């Protein structure tokens, strides 16, 4: 149980550890270092040295080659990383393999982006030459959650490194073993010691210490709105900018002229993937009245066949990350049952699934009231809420009727309607007749309102990890 | 003494006023509405309706013409606005006129930028078309300080309007009469009611109510770091992004091979302008040892010739904004004198200048210790701190040695040295053989560290006043 | 009867003028100077002095203000300019007014684009700073045709002026009076003498002398493919780049699910406007078999009700530009008739329309073979060729089955189909459920294949009128 | 002796060949295929199939992976490629190796630019969404000369492939063996058959057939101005755009305050590299009068120390490409000597150098008249023309005084003068206190005047190998 600081695995200052639990059987199988304020201090110091040293001395093209080599390392180590991630997060091996493949894709994409991050030359007064350069913030802080340790890591650190920053990472205490191994791969790729630091530990300890640290120049946060609020307010003490990738209540909007055959599998996977433990999960399906009942029936058909089991069983769902989250999903379903919200359909936990595991079957509820907590708050489970609308105006009103605004899905044949809704919908991403089929590495991702602010993924991410400097030359 | 809400002049909800004081004589000559939370509520309400209605229905090109007409109105009203601004802020008529001209330039520039704010189409999978659109936040909140009411209004509101946002403005209680008149010009120019809303009042009342309001989508702040911290933390409750344009300790770096004849007047005006009450004021001059004593003597002679009087007198410098700021400057100078920091030279207030006025002659101090409070903290007065350096390395160390990082000036003939230093210096702007060519409307402005974060002015500002939406179309 | 050179109206070197004919009655009412090689020499030399002098010294922002003022003068002179254009070209007064308004819009758009034409800073080796500047070619040559003298002038020259070039224009001998007046307006607007030079005359004289002149740095050509070929080959002697805006055979693609009510008036206007004398005129309509006969019937009814008469009569259509072009249209129709191609319907020429005028009623032909001359060659008359297709594949095959690739229209409600075809169609512009909008000033316009190459209109045009200079600084 | 068409090596149509000559000894050692029109026809048809099929179906990201793999293959085969290039061109093995590394760098650079070539979304009218897509031309033609077969193949084909085109290449009959080998490595890299086609042969046979072919959509030419003129006029028949990378007379401007110690080896290498057979070779040095004589003598010593021998000997310079070019350089030297132009110094050809080789010692001539042919015409040999200037004005006048305008070098310590001159110089690239740097892959390259037009290298090149399509959607 050691942190990764200055290119070496180092013991926690206060020498305490945190258990690593396999959510498939709920049993500990490893430990991580319990990071504290002195651990963060050592990490920032190392990151500062690397940025002001070798890594910062590297050209963008040189940073790109390191990132490209790292991408190859991840690709060669897909099965190894997929095993670690699946055992640690609980997701089926098929999804953990996809996450590893996506991780290598992040590094590959940004590897080519490094030397193509351009500034500008601006028209100005006579005898003047104005140019702008996009420089790294310096030391970037990264808070990575448990639902996608590798994907969000490659998303955040991959862009920050490409921008020329040195990084300090505080991954989630419920899943972070994959991140540690990736750090080893980065060292093998030729990444200078200190350019990437990992401090494991609790959010209120290691995470809070990072957000309060004056040695950080920029913070990339992914997690709950409550914690995002705290991190922002903590970082404000040092006037440090924070990107917020928070939760969401993303709607699927289905009209009567939609191809329900091609829409059905996507609607299911959008809420079943990673057990619904995804910020951009399609947790709401809004159906035009004409096809409300027919689509619910198809959704009911699919959900009834879904099965939940151990990660290694590679079924539709694995277990949830822990008991606390399992109880949270239970509370949503229990409340809904009390309020007379009909459960249209639900999956099943396999009989041989470990009792000590935290398993929850996918659930499809219908006739959900728009104002009801189930349709307003993020469940972070495989629970889909279905309700009807009468026209485009109500579709828009319902879709934007929650405090969240992350992603939205539009399913209709009419092209004019497609682009028209996409403009009215409040979301960082709008998908038309799909829902993030590809990895979405190239697609800038982020929310509005209580889904946070800022954009990561895509080329756009590099702008958030750099700060513009304007140079004005008077030469006559 | 009224607010400007929904295109009409409205009495404050609680019917109380705040005295408007001419700092040239320290006497009240007008009153403003003491804005409170209900006033902010109505302002945001009006902005939201305007954004969802007429103003939001307007195309980019249509918004541009509105700003262009406003630009012409301001240009025609330069003398009128300059008289109001100078009387309220205390700055000389020459500077007050320049501010109004800059205000017109902001609106002129952004008028042409409105329909040229482009999104992107991104390479993606086969059968896919990916496009991005840069949409306004919606309702933008604007905190405007007293030192440059018109100029900062122009860069903030001008960019926000061009981006398609509806604006709620809380200008400074110490000076905001010019902004109120600008709002009328906007109405004349054809800006729909509600698109621009002005709520006067105290920062801890009206200003706080803005920062707390959940109906605002983005905040543009310009002021003290302490206040900027609070505003950020207040807005974090609603996950509202805040741009921070804070203070600075901007250095002038002079080498032995520099053109002292050309540098000398710029070194002076950079700290004399607006009585040194400027975020990016050149409050530090770093001189190479070889020319340290000669340049100090020339700076001393120049400072002795500076005259301070009433704003109508239109001299080198006017009074400070109030007694609280005057006392703050006194405390800096008294502490420096007690610690044995020699005052090389100072200007003199003219005899007939009102005793009740808040006059402070520009002061030149030498041999200032880098770690001393005079060289570390922002004075916001006409005080220049002078010290020497041996080489480029120490110049960089001294320049980046404060918590601030907003603007830096480089004076040297060596071309290689110019660019080499510009890369090393920590600042949003670096000026080579000049210092703010004026008005720097096209030049993106912003700080690092305790100088804040984010960028305003120039085309780049539009990216801060919009949010990227990605649309992924699966069409085959 | 004089050229516009160096800010003054100067007599030609041959003094033998060219008649200006009103196509409404075929009678001359004015004269233009017959420019030859010596007239071109003085114009290029004048523009060279302007680019090296006052005009080249102006900032990008200063150039914008000139263009904005010119926009205002055109707007103030819409009636006068439209009167001239209508009398000279023959187009109905309503279309002449639109041309003038579009001219003012071009100047307005590029007035705001001037100081926003950014270059880049490129990531490079350590100790280096690489910046790119987009500098004007110098002296640009402009060949402007007779069908849209004002709009194409504003398109071509308005962009070249914003880019910072000085212009030498050779407008069409069949219609150029309006351009001469605009040149006066430009002078009144504050455009330096020599920045804009107009040399009237025959294409094989003044036009040929312009394309051959070594003093020109860039040629903007709009006209026939045969002449564009010759101009390119002539300019090849001086290695001068030429943008070729040539004709087309732009198809309108209508599917069975399209809105025929919304499509029908656009289908008609797209070929009737300016008497079909438009490069991007919708000269083909491709209809799905299911709605082939019903649409042709409605098109036939629409065409039978069309009225042609003198320009001042302001009917659906005016006369053609001259006898040669009238005969050209006659040849096409006569050729089609003899090949058994049916004429579904035709318009009406008013009985009191002057016999000496060049009138041609709009003609609708059906069942046109795809390989036939009528469906392959540009008519430049109000002639629409109708045919059917069975599926998207044939629709694409037919649409891309001519040497031309300029504009294409897609009429259908199927969203996926809209985007599918748009990517497959070989054209510079693809319109979905409209045709040409909407002015199209902001829309980059150009062709592929025999429709020419390069792009004008929109912001993109500035790249065609500038050349990239890369400055690589080694500073260590 | 075969072409590379449709992924396999096929025999010539007429089965005739061309001798491959080693310029070191002027002896034949291999043969290339004598390509004619039918060979070109099969090459274009193959490229069309690849573009309409597999290669065109590849996503931008997929194209990049092939390019990166090819980049790795070139790096793996540097020694083999360097040996082939040196023996075929005559350049020293050291330079041929650098050419190989440059080739790998081109593929690496464009591999990452592939999925990052963005289009735009443009602000337009209400109810509209406008997007722009940058599409490949389709089939691109590439004329590659003999001086830098690998490097020019890299910048031209690498960009075209990254842009999504299929390529038909006609390399120089004097040196094209390395290009053939690279084609194999492309196939090994996974590049689909037909995506890259190589047709060897004489320019008046294979080259002319390529330039005239209507199946080509875009021509990338690098060679003599005379041939560049023909190609343009040949392709003008099909309205095919041609990028002209032609020769130059690039000056080095040295002032009295310049670092002569750092400048001296660069001044020499810039003209000595590849025996002066470089379009952007520094064939002129302009020296301020104060340091004219000291620098001439300085350059004289350096030139006198130069050694010329066989390529394998790996000295300062190899032989010229053939007898024709050798005679050309001899004619230049004869005229200069006959006109009394003094030769300050010259290199040394080893006395035992192969008599049947085409060797030429580098020559430094002084007091060269600006109007003399040696100072106006491109020699394409290791000849440097030295002259003096009084001030910056004369320096600019002399630098821009030739019909060429490709690259320019500025040597001075004064920063203002650096940027001031950089704006005044007519060139595609301006280097400050360096010249060409290293590789210059990221630096957009191109000329003005008789240096041609269009830009290649850098990210900018992608715009030259794509065409802009605009899609205007009316959706309400
Ligand atoms: Ca775990
Ligand atoms: Ca006041
Ligand atoms: Ca006429
Ligand atoms: Ca016939
Ligand atoms: Ca050879
Ligand atoms: Mg928010
Ligand atoms: Mg900060
Ligand atoms: Mg063709």
JSON list of N, CA and C in Angstrom, two decimals, chain C residues 241-265:
[
{"chain": "C", "resi": 241, "resn": "UNK", "atom": "N", "xyz": [-2.20, 32.92, -58.68]},
{"chain": "C", "resi": 241, "resn": "UNK", "atom": "CA", "xyz": [-3.33, 32.06, -58.31]},
{"chain": "C", "resi": 241, "resn": "UNK", "atom": "C", "xyz": [-4.67, 32.66, -58.73]},
{"chain": "C", "resi": 242, "resn": "UNK", "atom": "N", "xyz": [-5.59, 31.81, -59.18]},
{"chain": "C", "resi": 242, "resn": "UNK", "atom": "CA", "xyz": [-6.91, 32.27, -59.60]},
{"chain": "C", "resi": 242, "resn": "UNK", "atom": "C", "xyz": [-7.99, 31.45, -58.91]},
{"chain": "C", "resi": 243, "resn": "UNK", "atom": "N", "xyz": [-8.95, 32.15, -58.30]},
{"chain": "C", "resi": 243, "resn": "UNK", "atom": "CA", "xyz": [-10.15, 31.50, -57.79]},
{"chain": "C", "resi": 243, "resn": "UNK", "atom": "C", "xyz": [-11.18, 31.46, -58.91]},
{"chain": "C", "resi": 244, "resn": "UNK", "atom": "N", "xyz": [-11.69, 30.27, -59.21]},
{"chain": "C", "resi": 244, "resn": "UNK", "atom": "CA", "xyz": [-12.64, 30.10, -60.31]},
{"chain": "C", "resi": 244, "resn": "UNK", "atom": "C", "xyz": [-14.06, 29.86, -59.82]},
{"chain": "C", "resi": 245, "resn": "UNK", "atom": "N", "xyz": [-14.90, 30.88, -59.94]},
{"chain": "C", "resi": 245, "resn": "UNK", "atom": "CA", "xyz": [-16.32, 30.74, -59.67]},
{"chain": "C", "resi": 245, "resn": "UNK", "atom": "C", "xyz": [-17.06, 30.60, -61.00]},
{"chain": "C", "resi": 246, "resn": "UNK", "atom": "N", "xyz": [-17.34, 29.36, -61.39]},
{"chain": "C", "resi": 246, "resn": "UNK", "atom": "CA", "xyz": [-17.95, 29.10, -62.68]},
{"chain": "C", "resi": 246, "resn": "UNK", "atom": "C", "xyz": [-19.42, 28.71, -62.53]},
{"chain": "C", "resi": 247, "resn": "UNK", "atom": "N", "xyz": [-20.02, 28.24, -63.62]},
{"chain": "C", "resi": 247, "resn": "UNK", "atom": "CA", "xyz": [-21.42, 27.87, -63.61]},
{"chain": "C", "resi": 247, "resn": "UNK", "atom": "C", "xyz": [-21.69, 26.50, -63.02]},
{"chain": "C", "resi": 248, "resn": "UNK", "atom": "N", "xyz": [-22.94, 26.08, -63.09]},
{"chain": "C", "resi": 248, "resn": "UNK", "atom": "CA", "xyz": [-23.32, 24.78, -62.56]},
{"chain": "C", "resi": 248, "resn": "UNK", "atom": "C", "xyz": [-24.57, 24.19, -63.18]},
{"chain": "C", "resi": 249, "resn": "UNK", "atom": "N", "xyz": [-24.92, 22.99, -62.75]},
{"chain": "C", "resi": 249, "resn": "UNK", "atom": "CA", "xyz": [-26.17, 22.35, -63.13]},
{"chain": "C", "resi": 249, "resn": "UNK", "atom": "C", "xyz": [-26.82, 21.84, -61.85]},
{"chain": "C", "resi": 250, "resn": "UNK", "atom": "N", "xyz": [-27.06, 22.76, -60.92]},
{"chain": "C", "resi": 250, "resn": "UNK", "atom": "CA", "xyz": [-27.51, 22.44, -59.58]},
{"chain": "C", "resi": 250, "resn": "UNK", "atom": "C", "xyz": [-28.88, 21.78, -59.55]},
{"chain": "C", "resi": 251, "resn": "UNK", "atom": "N", "xyz": [-28.95, 20.57, -58.96]},
{"chain": "C", "resi": 251, "resn": "UNK", "atom": "CA", "xyz": [-30.20, 19.80, -58.88]},
{"chain": "C", "resi": 251, "resn": "UNK", "atom": "C", "xyz": [-31.02, 20.09, -57.62]},
{"chain": "C", "resi": 252, "resn": "UNK", "atom": "N", "xyz": [-32.33, 19.99, -57.76]},
{"chain": "C", "resi": 252, "resn": "UNK", "atom": "CA", "xyz": [-33.23, 19.97, -56.61]},
{"chain": "C", "resi": 252, "resn": "UNK", "atom": "C", "xyz": [-33.74, 18.55, -56.44]},
{"chain": "C", "resi": 253, "resn": "UNK", "atom": "N", "xyz": [-33.43, 17.94, -55.30]},
{"chain": "C", "resi": 253, "resn": "UNK", "atom": "CA", "xyz": [-33.78, 16.54, -55.07]},
{"chain": "C", "resi": 253, "resn": "UNK", "atom": "C", "xyz": [-34.99, 16.43, -54.14]},
{"chain": "C", "resi": 254, "resn": "UNK", "atom": "N", "xyz": [-36.11, 15.96, -54.68]},
{"chain": "C", "resi": 254, "resn": "UNK", "atom": "CA", "xyz": [-37.36, 15.89, -53.93]},
{"chain": "C", "resi": 254, "resn": "UNK", "atom": "C", "xyz": [-37.80, 14.44, -53.74]},
{"chain": "C", "resi": 255, "resn": "UNK", "atom": "N", "xyz": [-38.06, 14.07, -52.49]},
{"chain": "C", "resi": 255, "resn": "UNK", "atom": "CA", "xyz": [-38.54, 12.73, -52.17]},
{"chain": "C", "resi": 255, "resn": "UNK", "atom": "C", "xyz": [-40.04, 12.73, -51.90]},
{"chain": "C", "resi": 256, "resn": "UNK", "atom": "N", "xyz": [-40.63, 11.54, -51.84]},
{"chain": "C", "resi": 256, "resn": "UNK", "atom": "CA", "xyz": [-42.08, 11.40, -51.72]},
{"chain": "C", "resi": 256, "resn": "UNK", "atom": "C", "xyz": [-42.61, 11.90, -50.38]},
{"chain": "C", "resi": 257, "resn": "UNK", "atom": "N", "xyz": [-41.73, 12.01, -49.39]},
{"chain": "C", "resi": 257, "resn": "UNK", "atom": "CA", "xyz": [-42.14, 12.43, -48.05]},
{"chain": "C", "resi": 257, "resn": "UNK", "atom": "C", "xyz": [-41.87, 13.92, -47.82]},
{"chain": "C", "resi": 258, "resn": "UNK", "atom": "N", "xyz": [-41.48, 14.62, -48.88]},
{"chain": "C", "resi": 258, "resn": "UNK", "atom": "CA", "xyz": [-41.16, 16.03, -48.77]},
{"chain": "C", "resi": 258, "resn": "UNK", "atom": "C", "xyz": [-42.41, 16.89, -48.64]},
{"chain": "C", "resi": 259, "resn": "UNK", "atom": "N", "xyz": [-42.23, 18.11, -48.17]},
{"chain": "C", "resi": 259, "resn": "UNK", "atom": "CA", "xyz": [-43.33, 19.07, -48.08]},
{"chain": "C", "resi": 259, "resn": "UNK", "atom": "C", "xyz": [-43.44, 19.82, -49.40]},
{"chain": "C", "resi": 260, "resn": "UNK", "atom": "N", "xyz": [-44.29, 19.31, -50.29]},
{"chain": "C", "resi": 260, "resn": "UNK", "atom": "CA", "xyz": [-44.43, 19.87, -51.63]},
{"chain": "C", "resi": 260, "resn": "UNK", "atom": "C", "xyz": [-44.98, 21.29, -51.61]},
{"chain": "C", "resi": 261, "resn": "UNK", "atom": "N", "xyz": [-45.77, 21.60, -50.58]},
{"chain": "C", "resi": 261, "resn": "UNK", "atom": "CA", "xyz": [-46.34, 22.94, -50.44]},
{"chain": "C", "resi": 261, "resn": "UNK", "atom": "C", "xyz": [-45.25, 23.96, -50.15]},
{"chain": "C", "resi": 262, "resn": "UNK", "atom": "N", "xyz": [-44.25, 23.57, -49.37]},
{"chain": "C", "resi": 262, "resn": "UNK", "atom": "CA", "xyz": [-43.15, 24.45, -49.02]},
{"chain": "C", "resi": 262, "resn": "UNK", "atom": "C", "xyz": [-42.08, 24.44, -50.11]},
{"chain": "C", "resi": 263, "resn": "UNK", "atom": "N", "xyz": [-41.98, 23.33, -50.83]},
{"chain": "C", "resi": 263, "resn": "UNK", "atom": "CA", "xyz": [-40.94, 23.16, -51.83]},
{"chain": "C", "resi": 263, "resn": "UNK", "atom": "C", "xyz": [-41.27, 23.87, -53.13]},
{"chain": "C", "resi": 264, "resn": "UNK", "atom": "N", "xyz": [-42.55, 23.83, -53.51]},
{"chain": "C", "resi": 264, "resn": "UNK", "atom": "CA", "xyz": [-42.99, 24.32, -54.82]},
{"chain": "C", "resi": 264, "resn": "UNK", "atom": "C", "xyz": [-42.59, 25.77, -55.15]},
{"chain": "C", "resi": 265, "resn": "UNK", "atom": "N", "xyz": [-42.85, 26.73, -54.24]},
{"chain": "C", "resi": 265, "resn": "UNK", "atom": "CA", "xyz": [-42.46, 28.09, -54.63]},
{"chain": "C", "resi": 265, "resn": "UNK", "atom": "C", "xyz": [-40.95, 28.30, -54.66]}
]
